[PDB]
Amino acid sequence: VKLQESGGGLVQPKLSCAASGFTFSSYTMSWVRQTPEKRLEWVAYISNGGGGTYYPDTVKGRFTISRDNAKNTLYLQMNSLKEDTAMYYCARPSRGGSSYWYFDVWGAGTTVTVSSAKTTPPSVYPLAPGSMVTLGCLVKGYFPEPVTVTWNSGSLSSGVHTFPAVLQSDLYTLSSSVTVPSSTWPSETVTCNVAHPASSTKVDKKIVPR
């Protein structure tokens, strides 16, 4: 049982959710969003038969929830966006029927950015130093959020610190550090992997000494 969502992206002032593993026609559906603040918010509700739809006041009129039971998919159409910038989840209630049930399955989430700025890929710079060693790489001048940083495709997982992006308008900068035993670097190869989906850019940068 999974919910797979489809973007999503950047817009200056329609999402889909594909369901499998359960009987979609028997459950209601909802959209939830997570603000850049740590705040969770219910955004739309649809019933089993798509005849019921409800929205909160902070979004009513601009959003329209819909479903296609034939293809086990849910949709959300968003218009006149503003501080609607958030990550959007499709959530499924824990039980069948048109009664309201707490959510028990969540999609991975797709981000929606509403800004009067334009997509910029990051410039990715390696941080090599001039017991254990700390390395880093700097992800500079991109827009919008988010970016994914990993080390050795994800295999270095302990001792990794990825710092929250800071907007020195109108661009984000982020940095990431990894700590490894002495000699495993530079003997082995350490590469930071960065992905910026809103610009379809992906860099791998090896950390070279000196």
Place this chain on the structure above:
Amino acid sequence: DIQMTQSPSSLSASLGGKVTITCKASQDINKYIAWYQHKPGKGPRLLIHYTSSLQPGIPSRFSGSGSGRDYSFSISNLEPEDIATYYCLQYDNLYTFGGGTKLEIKRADAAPTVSIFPPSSEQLTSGGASVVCFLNNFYPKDINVKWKIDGSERQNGVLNSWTDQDSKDSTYSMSSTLTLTKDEYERHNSYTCEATSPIVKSFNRN
């Protein structure tokens, strides 16, 4: 639209202690309340439904209680893994999440591990010069970085970023970036970040 008042928005507690969050609804919600835990990078995780019904797999240290308008959620024998954000959700009639409650766990003071990094060659040939300082695995979160170029304090061009509390360490990490042009970078030799008796790390453009 039913309104949920979660409180407090943020909590600090000792290891092994107990903590308690309350949600207050704008009408009777008839025990149709749930509690979720959210960890950065993970989808929301359900802890309690129908006020006090624990989920399978949820430790008995989590508990809920309440009726009508007043509800409470508690975590006892606090563990480092319990560092997250917690939300209530009424589903009596439609849905309303509470405001959220970030939880931090106290611990013994820790000095940061500091490292300084010169600008990379790629950035230099493109006209820029960012010097990066990491202050890793320290406690508590209040710390200060001072940048010195050739022995003199430099204040313009610094951007700072803290991580959230570590779920296994209870420490914090912080990153400080000094950005100069490549032009002003090449006119000086010694670069220093001091973390506040301070901890100093430097390099010289040889």
